[PDB]
Symmetry: D2
Subunit: 264 residues, 4 copies
């Protein structure tokens, strides 16, 4: 009986369904797939990319950037929600082909540096090509690119380095506060008494209070279904989207119900 | 007028004064200098080293390890308080000559990986040879070597990755709770409104409460004067040493007096 | 038409067939699989491991090390032929669970650091968890562990960092020169005019002359079929094994026949 | 008798004497100091920087780049001759402030990654802030930026990763072949029987033949005195500059005279 073969990280086909650039505000665009969020922000001095999705999406992300008049050498900065394969997948290839830099916290950097291997909960089951972080950011640090200021808010839980980003864009002159908040889920996580994450419950609770107080008028998430976005319907994509308090309150009730069944 | 020459990190001569191994408990020893703490813990499966001091102390640390019957290949683990040159200096050379591994958190790892360069407060003024961290530890994670369990307690402030360590040793059969707590000082730090550390005051305050609640019967610090240790007097080294509440309360009063003068 | 799913690196089942430790000489053992070579060398000061095979073989390698009386904390050094997933797979997990160090050249280190991703010929198709190299070795450098000296011989071609290792063991007192030489194959490689490897043909030719002059009495390869070893037959495993000149001459004829068909 | 203090890497004041941009050809400029070469190449798609000199020269290099109409976000690529502190010093700070990427071979990358520490000949005596290499280049690989193609030629010896660069510029329409070749010196090196560099003499000899065959009409070196450049005299800077054969022949005679005195 020989050892088993390696298994590939397979996702639902909807996660890999390419879509044309969808406009969120005057400067923010969705260039990912139907169920994976990859936000592009066009500024006067370059473009910022938030997440990239699965690792095989680098060619698609470059296509949509070309459609917005953004050359590869115009991507200046890559920001991440958390360093998982379905969000930070193409960061390695995107760095080689665009000349951009990556800014993330220490926890996201060390997870990104080892390609998501040795995950606290998944181990080596979900591995993507590694990439280095050129700039280390702290909680509440302001990253400015082309006049648009990005503020990081640490919300650990899903991963230790889970970071929420906030920035102010315009909607035909009217300012709008956007908040790209990370996932607040714990799929298959051992919450209570985890030797690899001893203070996980504390971090999750404190993160719920963090996203409740986020300066937010329009909320987006790495998985658009978590914030009730519908990238397929285009114009009405932000129709039934949730607030920050609602998304936090909904996630916390699921965390307590999950924690309760774990003590059984 | 040519550009200035580089300046070397010079310390007081007392920091570099070698001393013979001083016994703290049945398994814990001080093998550093008179004013720099480097703790060695002998176990049945190997030895653990906490800090190393200045980078030019690797030869001295190996001498004292040889005196305790510890071969270079017997050092199994290196733990750090924070990745500064006067504490984590010889970690690079100690790894090459002992075959040991380093365990630190993400913030200490990224600071250790770039050799203390690009410090949040000191910049490139205090640079030491870089070294990689083989194991990443979380807050409250238990690291066991030879039956002795080391528990990490995150106390950020002096550095983002400042970690306090606790373990239980014996004093001729009687158990003793030891707590090696990091420095709680902010020398020349801009505390209020620091763009490189926006939540520094919050982290400092929460760290004072962390060291107050540390399970501690005997307290040691990277600088022994901070906890009123006197490594010169040998037997009476722990005579006038401070408690955890006293060391925290003394450091917090200095933090508030420093914060008050900063708003002036 | 959504983007395709990721494909897993699948190998022949014979590559993953566990086998009991096979004795090569007084100190050298085969602890890998039937068709993947993982050499263990027991010394008075510890054990050296050459290669590990596929990444899912860490548990098997530890089992055979336990059978030879080698505890996890007794593995002191890991040496590699080249940093590919079917040879350097478990190096990341083996470092975390044994406390060993890795010694490889610069080319093998940078390939090992990015987990085999961005291969010069395979791209991201063959990815394994990354690992760092603690010691950098040069061509002809001697690495000594427990009295047994390992000499590295650079033989680039299959990978830029392909390294052959030589050491002298005994066969019941009689000395024997062992040479673990890397693969001299180019499967699917574009040999002529490769923009990612412009001097590949020169490196391959110079490597044939390198393995011809290797001090060798018994030859082993990462794939035992390349040197006509038969790990299944146990005692007669080295029966029809090839010399160094024969293995080089056989590989060079295949390289020229491959280069000839490429110019057609 | 306490341990000695750390010593700072001090150089001659002429090495740190800032100078205004000196024109080499239609696109190549000297923006370093009087005795340290830092070449800037302006293209239609950005600027390439070859070397940076001492680490405290980042502010000066940015000043001269601003004088040539080159914004910080216009530096796209950094190329190195070898990763020593007097050539690769400011690469870390230049990456943080310009958003550029670094391209170097594996040997230069691993030396650049550890900040020049653990030098094969100097140890930890000459340490600069570390920096990562975003792209790994092979011998003879072509790097194109804005139509100008840079070809790397490995010439190991001074350092294992010593790389010479060649590119074709114009002199008011007339093409000119420029060759920026590394230093061919061995200051204080143990040449014969070096355990850290066993094949050093072979690499030095093969490097002399490499620079002799370099496609070169105008030669420059990291130290301009090595190729008889005089950056002070401005217009007549290339007056008495040497050819490639002359610079190689002069360096080889010094290598043999140095090797002869070593065997005495
Ligand atoms: C690592 O990627 C994830 N996990 C998986 O794909 C498998 C392994 C799983 O469900 O256990 C993960 O975390 N995600 C999230 C999230 O909310 O971030 C959700 C909801 C589930 O999908 C991705
Ligand atoms: C980086 O090393 C330190 N700083 C210096 O040496 C100079 C630069 C300084 O005083 O500003 C630093 O922090 N230390 C501590 C500590 O408590 O940790 C104290 C009390 C002061 O000494 C060391
Ligand atoms: C990356 O691993 C290899 N390649 C593959 O598995 C597939 C991708 C392939 O054949 O192209 C590779 O190289 N090997 C060797 C070797 O001789 O080293 C041989 C003979 C073939 O198997 C492994
Ligand atoms: C590490 O920097 C160098 N060495 C020194 O500065 C001291 C340490 C020394 O001379 O031994 C080094 O190599 N250089 C070269 C070169 O040709 O590259 C020459 C000629 C000498 O200066 C620099
Ligand atoms: Zn996830
Ligand atoms: Zn996810
Ligand atoms: Zn300090
Ligand atoms: Zn200190
Ligand atoms: Zn291979
Ligand atoms: Zn193979
Ligand atoms: Zn040099
Ligand atoms: Zn030099």
């Amino acid at each position: 009986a020989p050892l088993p073969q390696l298994r590939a990280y397979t996702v639902d086909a909807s996660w890999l369904q390419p879509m044309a650039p969808l406009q969120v505000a005057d400067h923010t665009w969705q260039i990912g797939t139907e169920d994976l969020t990859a936000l592009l922000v066009q500024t006067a001095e370059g473009a910022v990319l938030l997440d990239g999705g699965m690792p095989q999406m680098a060619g698609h992300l470059l296509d949509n950037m070309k459609l917005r008049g953004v050359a590869p050498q115009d991507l200046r900065l890559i920001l991440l929600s958390h360093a998982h394969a379905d969000h930070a997948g193409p960061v390695a290839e995107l760095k080689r082909r665009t000349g951009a830099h990556v800014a993330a916290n220490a926890e996201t950097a060390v997870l990104l540096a080892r390609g998501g291997s040795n995950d606290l909960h998944f181990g080596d089951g979900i591995t993507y090509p590694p990439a280095s972080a050129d700039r280390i950011i702290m909680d509440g640090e302001v990253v400015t690119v082309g006049g648009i200021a990005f503020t990081a808010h640490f919300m650990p839980g899903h991963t230790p380095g889970s970071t929420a980003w906030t920035w102010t864009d315009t909607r035909d002159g009217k300012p709008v506060r956007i908040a790209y908040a990370d996932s607040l889920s714990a799929p298959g996580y051992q919450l209570k008494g985890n030797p690899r994450y001893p203070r996980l419950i504390e971090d999750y609770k404190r993160s719920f209070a963090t996203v409740r107080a986020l300066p937010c008028d329009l909320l987006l998430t790495p998985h658009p279904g978590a914030s009730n976005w519908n990238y397929a319907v285009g114009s009405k994509a932000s129709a039934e989207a949730l607030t920050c308090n609602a998304y936090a309150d909904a996630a916390e009730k699921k965390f307590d119900a999950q924690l309760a069944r774990e003590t059984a």
